Design an enzyme around this catalytic site. Structure first.
Site, short mmCIF file in Angstrom:
data_model
loop_
_atom_site.label_atom_id
_atom_site.label_comp_id
_atom_site.label_asym_id
_atom_site.label_seq_id
_atom_site.Cartn_x
_atom_site.Cartn_y
_atom_site.Cartn_z
N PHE A 1 0.83 3.30 -1.69
CA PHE A 1 0.17 3.59 -0.42
C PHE A 1 -1.10 2.73 -0.30
O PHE A 1 -1.96 2.75 -1.21
CB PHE A 1 -0.22 5.07 -0.37
CG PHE A 1 -0.51 5.58 1.00
CD1 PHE A 1 0.52 5.80 1.91
CD2 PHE A 1 -1.83 5.87 1.39
CE1 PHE A 1 0.25 6.28 3.21
CE2 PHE A 1 -2.12 6.35 2.67
CZ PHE A 1 -1.08 6.56 3.58
N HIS B 1 -7.20 3.33 2.49
CA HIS B 1 -7.50 4.21 3.61
C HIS B 1 -8.72 5.05 3.29
O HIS B 1 -9.09 5.13 2.14
CB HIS B 1 -6.32 5.13 3.90
CG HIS B 1 -5.99 6.06 2.78
ND1 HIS B 1 -5.15 5.70 1.74
CD2 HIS B 1 -6.35 7.34 2.55
CE1 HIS B 1 -5.03 6.73 0.91
NE2 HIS B 1 -5.76 7.73 1.37
N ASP C 1 -9.80 9.15 3.96
CA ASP C 1 -9.11 10.42 4.30
C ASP C 1 -9.54 10.97 5.66
O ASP C 1 -10.71 10.85 6.05
CB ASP C 1 -9.41 11.49 3.25
CG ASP C 1 -8.61 11.33 1.98
OD1 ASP C 1 -7.75 10.42 1.91
OD2 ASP C 1 -8.82 12.13 1.05
N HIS D 1 -9.72 4.31 -0.74
CA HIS D 1 -8.94 4.40 -1.94
C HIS D 1 -7.50 4.07 -1.64
O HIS D 1 -7.10 4.05 -0.47
CB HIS D 1 -9.08 5.78 -2.56
CG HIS D 1 -8.80 6.91 -1.61
ND1 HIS D 1 -9.72 7.33 -0.66
CD2 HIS D 1 -7.72 7.72 -1.47
CE1 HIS D 1 -9.21 8.34 0.02
NE2 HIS D 1 -8.00 8.60 -0.45
C1 ASV Z 1 -3.97 12.44 -0.91
C2 ASV Z 1 -2.91 11.66 -1.76
C3 ASV Z 1 -1.70 11.09 -0.93
N1 ASV Z 1 -2.10 10.44 0.38
C4 ASV Z 1 -1.64 10.82 1.64
O1 ASV Z 1 -0.86 11.76 1.89
C5 ASV Z 1 -2.25 10.06 2.84
C6 ASV Z 1 -3.54 9.49 2.32
S1 ASV Z 1 -4.65 10.87 1.84
N2 ASV Z 1 -2.59 11.07 3.89
C7 ASV Z 1 -1.77 11.50 4.88
O2 ASV Z 1 -0.61 11.06 5.03
C8 ASV Z 1 -2.36 12.61 5.85
C9 ASV Z 1 -1.40 13.86 5.91
C10 ASV Z 1 -1.87 14.98 6.86
C11 ASV Z 1 -0.93 16.22 6.92
N3 ASV Z 1 0.47 15.89 7.26
C12 ASV Z 1 -1.47 17.12 8.04
O3 ASV Z 1 -0.82 17.18 9.10
O4 ASV Z 1 -2.58 17.67 7.81
C13 ASV Z 1 -0.94 10.14 -1.90
O5 ASV Z 1 -0.92 10.48 -3.12
O6 ASV Z 1 -0.35 9.15 -1.40
FE FE2 Z 2 -6.27 9.71 0.51
#
Ligand code: ASV
Ligand code: FE2
Length: 329
Positions: A209, A212, A214, A268
């Site tokens: 990933f 980004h 958060d 991150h």
């Molecule tokens: C936080 C760790 C994770 N990252 C992720 O999931 C990425 C970056 S934080 N974030 C997202 O997709 C936001 C999801 C929001 C969730 N569906 C909601 O509606 O509230 C990874 O490990 O890739």
């Molecule tokens: Fe994140």
């Protein structure tokens, strides 16, 4: 070499009690961490994380393709137009490795006023069949309230850290209306691993990933013991070490906003690693109408010129921007 991020371990237990000085000493630690790399591990947090990863492992391992379609968000199932946030996020064998299940405030029911008013970002959770996954919905709803409790305590820490009374953030974080989500993420071991699921960074690093900030006030993350995270510094990315007994904490862009970037939302990214692992973030979001007046800890008068930003609006924009930059998860 890629260097190692300094991620302190902070004993957060005094944040549950009434020793006020001890809470200030936790706060200072949260302050130092927030101004450095922006990550810390909360330790002595009181949550059974072994029960968490176990129940999460049973679930991801026993769910069938049929059930995934039944619980699928709109991105994967045209029939589920109401499921923007809550539901299953499917992997795509040969193409996409990660899969996950997101759920919202369990108080969001058909007779919840935000649900009856059809307010954006509020959805009624969907669950699997109780007989195929016994105890899973009870486990997950209780987890939601457990990590809710932890987050409230952490927010008292952040509020003290910024020189505010302890309820500054927490007064807006309520069981009846919080937009907080839990995401149960599986990263699989695959051999061979699908190339489309691996991204190459400008710096050559292979990623699951991309970079980004958060979308959250703070993020409260449990992960199994496979090192994968990196945080961006002026000197390039640094590795964040894993700790499967603690919660990794960081600020999201709403905190950066509120504080005039005094507490940054750290950039991150997720390195590609070919290993079975779990990532269980809790995104600490407020109510749809929550507004915190921005302020600047650097200024003697604390005044900020930034507009207050309503949480529901911030969240809506944020979730959409994230999908656009880093893709549909
Ligand atoms: C936080 C760790 C994770 N990252 C992720 O999931 C990425 C970056 S934080 N974030 C997202 O997709 C936001 C999801 C929001 C969730 N569906 C909601 O509606 O509230 C990874 O490990 O890739
Ligand atoms: Fe994140």
């Amino acid at each position: 070499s890629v260097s190692k991020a300094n991620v302190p371990k902070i004993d957060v237990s005094p944040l549950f009690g009434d020793d006020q000085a001890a809470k200030m000493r936790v706060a200072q630690q949260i302050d130092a961490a927030s101004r450095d790399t922006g990550f810390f591990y909360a330790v002595n947090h009181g949550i059974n994380v072994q029960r968490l990863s176990q129940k999460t492992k049973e679930f991801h391992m026993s769910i069938t393709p049929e059930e995934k379609w039944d619980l699928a968000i709109r991105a994967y199932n045209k029939e589920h137009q109401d499921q923007v946030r809550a539901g299953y996020y499917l992997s795509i064998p040969g193409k996409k490795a990660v899969e996950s299940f997101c759920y919202l405030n369990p108080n969001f029911t058909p007779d919840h006023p935000r649900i009856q008013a059809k307010t954006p970002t509020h959805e009624v959770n969907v669950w699997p069949d109780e007989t195929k996954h016994p105890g899973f919905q009870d486990f997950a709803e209780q987890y939601y309230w457990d990590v809710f409790g932890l987050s409230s305590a952490l927010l008292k820490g952040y509020a003290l850290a910024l020189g505010k009374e302890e309820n500054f953030f927490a007064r807006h974080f309520k069981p009846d209306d919080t937009l907080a989500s839990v995401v149960l993420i599986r990263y699989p071991y695959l051999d061979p691993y699908p190339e489309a699921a691996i991204k190459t960074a400008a710096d050559g690093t292979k990623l699951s990933f991309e970079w980004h900030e958060d979308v959250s006030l703070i993020t409260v993350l449990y992960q199994s013991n496979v090192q994968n995270l990196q945080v961006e510094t002026a000197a390039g990315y640094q590795d964040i070490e894993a700790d499967d007994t603690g919660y990794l904490i960081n600020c999201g862009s709403y905190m950066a906003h509120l504080t005039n970037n005094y507490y940054k939302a750290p950039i991150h990214r997720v390195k590609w690693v070919n290993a079975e692992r779990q990532s269980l973030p809790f995104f600490v979001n407020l109510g749809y109408d929550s507004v915190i007046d921005p302020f600047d800890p650097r200024e003697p008068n604390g005044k900020s010129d930034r507009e207050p930003l309503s949480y529901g609006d911030y969240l809506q924009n944020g979730l959409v921007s994230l999908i656009n930059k880093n893709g549909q998860t």
